[PDB]
Write an enzyme that holds these catalytic residues in place. Structure first.
Site, PDB file in Angstrom:
ATOM      1  N   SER A  57       0.780  -1.244   0.000  1.00 38.39           N
ATOM      2  CA  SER A  57       0.000   0.000   0.000  1.00 38.39           C
ATOM      3  C   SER A  57       0.810   1.292   0.000  1.00 38.39           C
ATOM      4  CB  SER A  57      -0.960   0.027   1.188  1.00 38.39           C
ATOM      5  OG  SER A  57      -0.253  -0.023   2.412  1.00 38.39           O
ATOM      6  N   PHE A  81      -2.158  -3.302   5.486  1.00 39.25           N
ATOM      7  CA  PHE A  81      -2.794  -3.093   6.777  1.00 39.25           C
ATOM      8  C   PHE A  81      -3.059  -1.602   6.893  1.00 39.25           C
ATOM      9  CE2 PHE A  81      -3.611  -4.860  10.962  1.00 39.25           C
ATOM     10  CZ  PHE A  81      -3.658  -3.740  11.764  1.00 39.25           C
ATOM     11  N   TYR A 242      22.330   0.294  11.132  1.00 40.36           N
ATOM     12  CA  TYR A 242      21.626  -0.365  10.044  1.00 40.36           C
ATOM     13  C   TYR A 242      22.374  -1.559   9.474  1.00 40.36           C
ATOM     14  CZ  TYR A 242      18.313   3.434  10.519  1.00 40.36           C
ATOM     15  OH  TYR A 242      17.410   4.330  11.034  1.00 40.36           O
ATOM     16  N   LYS A 251      18.782  -8.412   9.289  1.00 38.30           N
ATOM     17  CA  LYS A 251      19.167  -8.493   7.879  1.00 38.30           C
ATOM     18  C   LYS A 251      20.031  -9.722   7.592  1.00 38.30           C
ATOM     19  CE  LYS A 251      18.625  -3.538   7.356  1.00 38.30           C
ATOM     20  NZ  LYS A 251      19.294  -2.205   7.258  1.00 38.30           N
TER      21      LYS A 251
END
Length: 404
Positions: A57, A81, A242, A251
């Site tokens: 979305s 959602f 990250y 990850k």
């Protein structure tokens, strides 16, 4: 157009780190611009025909749905959602994005079905499987693009919470307080083993694997199917969080997960890859470590080089150049890469050089913080070309045959 009191004049309202309003017409215009971009390079030949996008979305997931449908000509099933418009309180941006996707797709003749619910849940997997059986038979591409801060585990019922922390030692990270519009430092303590485990549970590969296992068991994964999960790696500026922190562990789990997924699909000539994309503004950007500062600097530097771009450019290229291209950009771990322009060495050098030079006084001039804020508002349908923000707009927009 009819002068109705039910139409609203909606202006952007940012409170703290979130935009609490949404402009339906802006969202639809944004979807149209993305469709138009994909049309620039024309059709995507030899692409997928029956595509499932999990997280369809907003952001990269929406761009994947758009590139697949309007670029490759694919029927699509999107899972998301979002909040439906209710008692004259407008829905979320993702709702209006998906409604606009549906409208554009219906006009062109591209079949589209959507499921609105928790993608982490077994019930939603079941309903999505039934929809595939009903509309598609089998899917030949499964895109995984879920970015949720928490996950209620379908088996244990435990709600896992993701955390963005370093590992081994504390870090102190420069950033922008987007609320107060000032430079700040955030001290982050090293993640605990529980925090690491929970972050892996939310952002790692388990749900992706559960999706693939369930699709395959139900017999709705086509022979030769591909699956990809989207992620971000970045470079040195943000690596403590990250890449090496709790998020990094998630990850690493994606990388391990994809090797098994690839083995599963390779038998019938399919494939599985992690695809790495560039940094963009997202709905959560203003609240997370480093990102508004990093984005503001990155935008300034790449715009100066003429290489700035967002979700649709990234994903259209990923699909053409790598997922369905004959010379894909691949790294040492076997990930597909769309992020080369961000990793340009002169770009990274300039961001690094400027990093400690940003102050309260020079925030707007030394960085593209204006651009960060504009791109933040675009997520909610504000500041889009061709939209008259003075004109009343209807909040109650429907999505046909939505599955819930």
């Amino acid at each position: 157009l009819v002068p109705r009191g039910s139409h609203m004049i909606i202006k952007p309202r940012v409170r703290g780190f979130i935009c609490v309003t949404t402009h339906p017409a802006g969202c639809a215009a944004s979807v149209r611009e993305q469709i138009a971009y994909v049309a620039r390079r024309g059709p995507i030949e030899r692409g997928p025909k029956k595509v499932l996008v999990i997280g369809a979305s907003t952001g990269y997931g929406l761009a994947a749905r758009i590139a697949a449908a309007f670029g490759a000509g694919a029927a699509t099933l999107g899972v998301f959602f979002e909040r439906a418009p209710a008692d004259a309180k407008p829905g979320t941006a993702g709702w209006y994005n998906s409604a606009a996707f549906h409208d554009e797709a219906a006009a062109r003749g591209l079949q589209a079905t959507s499921v609105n619910g928790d993608a982490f849940s077994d019930e939603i997997k079941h309903k999505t499987i039934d929809a595939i059986r009903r509309d598609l038979g089998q899917v030949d591409l499964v895109v995984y693009s879920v970015a949720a801060p928490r996950r209620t585990h379908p088996k244990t019922g435990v709600t896992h919470q993701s955390t963005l922390k370093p590992i081994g030692h504390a870090v102190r990270l420069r950033g922008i307080d987007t609320d107060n519009e000032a430079i700040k430092e955030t001290l982050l303590q090293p993640a605990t083993p529980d925090e690491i485990a929970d972050t892996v549970a939310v952002m790692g590969g388990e749900d992706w694997r559960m999706w693939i296992d369930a699709l395959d068991a139900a017999g709705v994964l086509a022979d030769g199917a591909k699956t990809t999960a989207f992620t971000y790696l970045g470079e040195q500026v943000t690596h403590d969080i990250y890449w090496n922190g709790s998020i990094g562990e998630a990850k690493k789990d994606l990388d391990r997960t994809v090797l098994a997924l690839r083995g599963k699909l390779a038998a019938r000539g399919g494939d599985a890859r992690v695809s790495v994309l560039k940094a963009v503004v997202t709905q959560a950007s203003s609240a997370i470590p480093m990102m508004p500062l990093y984005l503001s600097l990155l935008f300034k530097v790449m715009k100066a080089r003429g290489t700035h771009e967002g979700c649709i450019e990234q994903v259209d290229g990923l699909l053409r150049d790598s997922l369905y291209g004959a010379q894909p950009h691949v790294d040492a771990e076997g990930r597909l890469r769309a992020d080369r322009l961000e990793l340009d060495p002169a770009v990274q050098a300039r961001v690094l050089e400027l990093w400690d030079q940003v102050t309260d006084d020079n925030l707007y001039t030394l960085t593209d913080f204006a651009g960060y804020k504009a791109e933040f508002l675009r997520l909610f349908g504000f500041g889009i070309d061709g939209v008259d923000y003075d004109a009343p707009v209807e909040p109650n927009v429907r999505i046909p045959n939505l599955i819930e």
